[PDB]
Symmetry: C4
């Protein structure tokens, strides 16, 4: 489960990184950052400057948000929770 | 279900696109982008400049957020999930 | 239920409107807009300029987000849903 | 439960405050504000300027969001709810 969600999220982020670095001309790290803050809905970034960037962002959000949060929801419940939960056992 | 949510979301976005392009004077693509990042709570955009824009955005958020996420929640569970889930069957 | 959540949300927004208009010197409409985009996590606005603004925003977010989304969750399920749901009956 | 979530959230915020004040050179209050708006996904702030800031923010979001919202979810259901709920008893 966690393994699959991790892969799907990585591929989704790779796609966004490639898109934004090419169309918006961002350095890879910036393109990945943009992709990440977009899909987690944090949004700490100014918007894309090109229409392609805007259209892709619209579609990228609708298709990638469900996945990203599904992953986050498992990362904290099936992994981070026990780590400290089972650790809460005297 | 997915069909209905898709329609309600499209109409909600069309309304926002028409509103922002008229009142804020944005090109259609920008008005749609603004509507989308607003309702998905991504918020990668500077705020509206007019009071009408601000008031509408306030109301648009409260009335459209529940719908948009209801749609996203079905798009990833009733459509995108199986696509890869059933595909996870040897 | 919806009645109570509506009141609690209105009071929460009134408080934020009064705070931001006084401490950040924003016109009432702007202070309300800021309060709304903050609590719905949309965040389409530059940050407060004063330390009081920042500290209050930190606390305002933790105390008001649960309430605001509880309201939104009822506004779309107990009110907006049937309106179109029962209307989906031939 | 609430006690544990409160601690984990405080430590998560302390870490972010120390990181951003050191790497991005922000005053402590600004570093805490940035950490808070990032993890609650409010995002009312311009992005970090350094690559370290961006990389850390990416990881900080994935590891801290689940926790922060788990805390918020308990703060409004196990604490703020009754306060007004039990108070709704004639
Ligand atoms: K958000
Ligand atoms: K959210
Ligand atoms: K934002
Ligand atoms: K923003
Ligand atoms: K946001």
């Amino acid at each position: 489960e966690f393994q699959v969600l991790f892969v799907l999220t990585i591929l989704t982020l790779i796609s966004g990184t490639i898109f934004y670095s090419t169309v918006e001309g961002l350095r890879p790290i910036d393109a990945l950052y943009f992709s990440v803050v977009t899909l987690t809905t944090v949004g700490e970034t100014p918007p894309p400057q090109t229409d392609f960037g805007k259209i892709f962002t619209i579609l990228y959000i609708f298709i990638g948000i469900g996945l990203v949060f599904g992953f986050i929801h498992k990362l904290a419940v099936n992994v981070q929770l026990p780590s400290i939960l089972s650790n809460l056992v005297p």
